[PDB]
Amino acid sequence: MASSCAVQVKLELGHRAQVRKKPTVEGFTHDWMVFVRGPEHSNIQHFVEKVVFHLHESFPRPKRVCKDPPYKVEESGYAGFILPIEVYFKNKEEPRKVRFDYDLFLHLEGHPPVNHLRCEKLTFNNPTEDFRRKLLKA
Amino acid sequence: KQTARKS
Secondary structure, eight states: OOOOOEEEEEEEEEEEEEEOSSOOTTOOOEEEEEEEEOGGGOOGGGTEEEEEEEOOTTSSSOEEEESSSSEEEEEEESSBEEEEEEEEESOSSSOSEEEEEEEEOOBOTTSOOEEEEEEEEEEEESOOHHHHHHHHHO | OBOOBOO
Protein backbone atom coordinates (compact mmCIF):
# COMPACT_ATOMS: atom_id res chain seq x y z
CA MET A 1 0.00 0.00 0.00
CA ALA A 2 2.34 2.73 -1.28
CA SER A 3 -0.11 5.40 -2.46
CA SER A 4 -1.02 8.40 -0.34
CA CYS A 5 -3.52 11.19 -0.69
CA ALA A 6 -4.01 14.72 0.64
CA VAL A 7 -7.47 16.25 0.25
CA GLN A 8 -8.14 19.99 0.56
CA VAL A 9 -11.60 21.50 0.97
CA LYS A 10 -12.42 25.22 0.94
CA LEU A 11 -14.85 26.72 3.44
CA GLU A 12 -16.42 30.16 3.35
CA LEU A 13 -17.25 31.81 6.67
CA GLY A 14 -18.94 35.16 6.67
CA HIS A 15 -21.63 37.41 7.97
CA ARG A 16 -23.88 40.31 7.09
CA ALA A 17 -24.98 43.00 9.53
CA GLN A 18 -27.27 45.94 8.96
CA VAL A 19 -28.77 48.61 11.19
CA ARG A 20 -32.46 48.09 11.77
CA LYS A 21 -34.70 50.87 10.48
CA LYS A 22 -36.47 50.63 13.86
CA PRO A 23 -34.60 49.15 16.85
CA THR A 24 -36.23 46.25 18.64
CA VAL A 25 -37.93 46.58 22.03
CA GLU A 26 -34.83 45.32 23.86
CA GLY A 27 -32.77 48.00 22.13
CA PHE A 28 -31.26 45.72 19.47
CA THR A 29 -30.00 48.03 16.74
CA HIS A 30 -28.73 45.49 14.17
CA ASP A 31 -29.94 42.47 12.25
CA TRP A 32 -27.17 40.06 11.43
CA MET A 33 -26.61 36.67 9.84
CA VAL A 34 -23.48 34.49 10.11
CA PHE A 35 -22.82 31.42 7.97
CA VAL A 36 -20.54 28.60 6.91
CA ARG A 37 -20.78 27.37 3.34
CA GLY A 38 -18.79 25.99 0.46
CA PRO A 39 -17.54 28.24 -2.31
CA GLU A 40 -19.57 28.69 -5.48
CA HIS A 41 -22.61 27.09 -3.84
CA SER A 42 -20.77 23.73 -3.57
CA ASN A 43 -22.37 21.22 -1.15
CA ILE A 44 -20.38 20.75 2.04
CA GLN A 45 -23.10 18.59 3.59
CA HIS A 46 -21.28 15.63 1.99
CA PHE A 47 -18.61 15.84 4.69
CA VAL A 48 -20.05 18.22 7.33
CA GLU A 49 -22.02 16.52 10.10
CA LYS A 50 -23.09 19.76 11.79
CA VAL A 51 -22.00 23.34 12.38
CA VAL A 52 -22.21 24.74 15.90
CA PHE A 53 -22.29 28.52 16.36
CA HIS A 54 -21.40 29.58 19.91
CA LEU A 55 -23.08 32.96 20.41
CA HIS A 56 -22.18 35.44 23.14
CA GLU A 57 -23.36 34.44 26.61
CA SER A 58 -25.83 37.36 26.52
CA PHE A 59 -27.87 35.49 23.90
CA PRO A 60 -30.54 33.00 25.00
CA ARG A 61 -29.70 29.40 24.02
CA PRO A 62 -26.26 30.56 22.78
CA LYS A 63 -25.12 27.18 21.38
CA ARG A 64 -26.84 27.18 17.99
CA VAL A 65 -26.64 23.83 16.18
CA CYS A 66 -27.20 23.47 12.42
CA LYS A 67 -27.37 19.80 11.49
CA ASP A 68 -28.49 20.64 7.93
CA PRO A 69 -27.73 23.45 5.47
CA PRO A 70 -27.83 26.32 5.38
CA TYR A 71 -25.30 26.49 8.20
CA LYS A 72 -26.28 29.89 9.47
CA VAL A 73 -27.75 31.86 12.35
CA GLU A 74 -29.91 34.98 11.94
CA GLU A 75 -30.13 37.20 15.02
CA SER A 76 -30.59 40.73 16.28
CA GLY A 77 -28.38 42.49 18.78
CA TYR A 78 -26.59 45.65 19.76
CA ALA A 79 -22.86 44.81 19.74
CA GLY A 80 -20.27 42.68 17.99
CA PHE A 81 -18.29 39.87 19.56
CA ILE A 82 -16.11 36.81 19.02
CA LEU A 83 -18.30 33.90 17.86
CA PRO A 84 -16.59 30.46 18.07
CA ILE A 85 -17.72 28.20 15.23
CA GLU A 86 -17.13 24.42 15.15
CA VAL A 87 -17.49 22.44 11.95
CA TYR A 88 -18.05 18.74 12.74
CA PHE A 89 -17.09 16.18 10.08
CA LYS A 90 -18.79 13.00 8.84
CA ASN A 91 -15.72 11.31 10.25
CA LYS A 92 -15.09 8.31 12.47
CA GLU A 93 -11.59 9.40 13.52
CA GLU A 94 -9.47 12.54 13.79
CA PRO A 95 -10.18 15.18 13.15
CA ARG A 96 -13.80 15.04 14.27
CA LYS A 97 -14.16 18.83 14.05
CA VAL A 98 -12.41 22.14 13.38
CA ARG A 99 -12.90 25.42 15.27
CA PHE A 100 -12.78 29.05 14.15
CA ASP A 101 -13.07 32.18 16.31
CA TYR A 102 -15.27 34.25 14.04
CA ASP A 103 -15.29 38.03 14.55
CA LEU A 104 -18.99 38.93 14.31
CA PHE A 105 -18.44 42.68 14.00
CA LEU A 106 -21.08 45.34 13.37
CA HIS A 107 -20.76 48.77 11.78
CA LEU A 108 -22.24 51.87 13.36
CA GLU A 109 -25.37 53.57 12.04
CA GLY A 110 -24.30 55.77 9.16
CA HIS A 111 -21.87 53.27 7.64
CA PRO A 112 -22.66 50.70 4.96
CA PRO A 113 -23.90 47.29 6.11
CA VAL A 114 -21.30 44.65 6.87
CA ASN A 115 -20.87 42.00 4.19
CA HIS A 116 -17.82 40.00 5.22
CA LEU A 117 -16.26 36.90 3.67
CA ARG A 118 -13.52 34.77 5.23
CA CYS A 119 -12.10 31.88 3.21
CA GLU A 120 -10.49 28.93 4.97
CA LYS A 121 -8.75 25.85 3.57
CA LEU A 122 -8.88 22.47 5.28
CA THR A 123 -6.33 19.73 4.58
CA PHE A 124 -6.87 16.03 5.28
CA ASN A 125 -3.82 13.80 4.78
CA ASN A 126 -4.65 10.15 4.04
CA PRO A 127 -8.30 10.26 5.19
CA THR A 128 -10.19 7.00 5.46
CA GLU A 129 -11.60 5.73 2.19
CA ASP A 130 -15.13 6.54 3.38
CA PHE A 131 -14.25 10.09 4.43
CA ARG A 132 -12.20 10.65 1.28
CA ARG A 133 -15.18 9.88 -0.95
CA LYS A 134 -17.36 12.20 1.15
CA LEU A 135 -14.81 15.03 0.96
CA LEU A 136 -14.49 14.63 -2.81
CA LYS A 137 -18.23 14.89 -3.45
CA ALA A 138 -18.05 18.50 -2.18
CA LYS B 1 -16.41 52.63 12.61
CA GLN B 2 -17.42 49.49 14.49
CA THR B 3 -20.11 49.42 17.15
CA ALA B 4 -19.19 48.64 20.72
CA ARG B 5 -18.34 45.04 21.54
CA LYS B 6 -19.19 42.46 24.16
CA SER B 7 -16.95 39.96 25.93
